[PDB]
Design a protein around this ligand. Structure first.
Ligand SMILES: *[C@@H]1O[C@H](CO)[C@@H](O[C@@H]2O[C@H](CO)[C@@H](O[C@@H]3O[C@H](CO)[C@@H](O)[C@H](O[C@H]4O[C@H](CO)[C@@H](O)[C@H](O)[C@@H]4O)[C@@H]3O)[C@H](O)[C@H]2NC(C)=O)[C@H](O)[C@H]1NC(C)=O
Ligand SMILES: *[C@@H]1O[C@H](CO)[C@@H](O[C@@H]2O[C@H](CO)[C@@H](O[C@@H]3O[C@H](CO)[C@@H](O)[C@H](O)[C@@H]3O)[C@H](O)[C@H]2NC(C)=O)[C@H](O)[C@H]1NC(C)=O
Ligand SMILES: *[C@@H]1O[C@H](CO)[C@@H](O[C@@H]2O[C@H](CO)[C@@H](O)[C@H](O)[C@H]2NC(C)=O)[C@H](O)[C@H]1NC(C)=O
Ligand code: NAG
Ligand code: NAG
Lengths: 132, 43, 53, 53
């Protein structure tokens, strides 16, 4: 009597779907990430740990090319040695959990690559607006 | 063996003290250095 | 530097009240001696020569 | 809300949150005693006898 689309659009509802259809919701996850005599100490360090995490992720996006877009692109191609999966199968076959456990080794390479690529993009954009 | 001109630095002090129970008092002794007791005022 | 008290020392527990405790110097076994410290002579002389330099 | 096509391994034995709950309940238990009253003057010699029966 409540409808199934609402609990599809609920928090962490699309964890079991394919990633292509799970792309249709991120804002609920992002919103529920943020905020929604001795004990208040524990309360308070939990709250500031949560906002410390949120600022770390916002800074990792801020050093990257996209700040509030929530869906980004870049200028580094995907190394096929990382995945060697078909482009059709990844969006309609796998869930994010098994995608994470696949690509979980290839981490902190891609981070530094994004940093390097858009640092080079920053100096290129500075050069283009300097010649003009 | 006490030297009358030098001084020992340890004193044997016996005193009343409470017990586990209130109505019972006890007599206990210990040792202390000269530098933590002073004389109050024969005996 | 070496530093010691050469006296052998026994403690003694004294119950003050309910669930209380207190430690006190009980008996002293052996020679009633005096605590002291030692340093090496020539090292102290040489280090004082360095600081006077 | 329900979640689907999902396999998750659980364990109650290597689970946490029973540990800090066992901490927190004894913690609140001790928070419920600091306003209360000690009985340090009560430990005393007791003249006891059998009840009237
Ligand atoms: C626990 O032990 C205590 C010990 O002190 C006990 O308290 C005492 O009990 C006795 C008997 O119950 C009391 O004596 C009575 O006192 C009342 C009040 O003064 C009198 O009226 C009583 O007189 C009646 O009984 C007499 C017996 O000959 C009759 O002659 C008379 O006509 C009355 O009918 C009797 O003397 C005593 O006063 C108390 N003391 C205190 C301080 O309370 C207590 O009862 C015990 N409790 C339990 C649960 O075991
Ligand atoms: C430990 O506590 C006890 C108990 O209070 C102390 O003992 C009491 O000491 C006083 C004075 O020293 C005694 O009074 C004197 O007693 C003698 C002997 O009868 C009498 O001749 C004097 O005229 C005077 O009345 C008191 O009797 C004594 N009581 C008991 C039970 O011993 C004691 O001094 C405390 N200290 C030590 C180290 O024990
Ligand atoms: C200080 O004195 C105590 C007296 O008890 C010594 O302890 C004894 O040491 C001997 C030999 O080491 C043992 O056989 C006894 O069993 C010990 N008794 C106790 C009660 O422990 C202690 O060794 C002395 N310390 C020094 C440095 O001489
Ligand atoms: C991840 O990498 C480790 C070593 O780097 C390797 O042992 C493991 O098999 C890898 N996992 C996957 C799913 O490739
Ligand atoms: C008191 O207690 C003892 C032991 O419980 C019992 O033997 C005795 O009958 C009781 N009553 C009296 C009046 O002593």
């Amino acid at each position: 009597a409540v409808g199934i689309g609402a609990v599809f659009l609920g928090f962490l509802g699309a964890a079991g779907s394919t990633m292509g259809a799970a792309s249709m919701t991120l804002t609920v996850q992002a919103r529920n990430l943020l905020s929604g005599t001795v004990w208040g100490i524990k309360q308070l360090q939990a709250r500031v740990l949560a906002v410390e995490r949120y600022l770390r992720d916002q800074q990792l996006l801020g050093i990257w090319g996209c700040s509030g877009k929530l869906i980004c692109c870049t200028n580094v191609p995907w190394n096929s040695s990382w995945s060697n999966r078909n482009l059709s199968e990844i969006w309609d076959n796998m869930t994010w959990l098994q995608w994470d456990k696949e690509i979980s080794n290839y981490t902190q390479i891609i981070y530094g690559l994004l940093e390097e690529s858009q640092n080079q993009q920053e100096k290129n954009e500075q050069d283009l607006l300097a010649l003009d | 063996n006490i030297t009358d001109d030098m001084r020992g630095e340890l004193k044997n002090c016996s005193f009343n003290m409470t017990t586990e129970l209130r109505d019972k008092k006890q007599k206990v002794y210990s040792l202390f250095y000269r530098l933590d007791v002073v004389q109050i005022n024969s005996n | 530097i070496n530093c010691t008290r050469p006296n052998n020392n026994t403690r003694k527990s004294i119950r003050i009240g309910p669930g209380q405790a207190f430690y006190a110097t009980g008996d002293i076994i052996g020679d009633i001696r005096q605590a002291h410290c030692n340093v090496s002579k020539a090292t102290w002389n040489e280090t004082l020569g360095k600081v006077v330099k | 809300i329900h979640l689907e096509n999902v396999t998750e391994e659980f364990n109650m034995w290597k689970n946490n949150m029973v540990e800090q709950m066992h901490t927190d309940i004894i913690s609140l238990w001790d928070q419920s005693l600091k306003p209360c009253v000690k009985l340090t003057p009560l430990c005393v010699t007791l003249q006891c006898t059998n009840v009237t029966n």
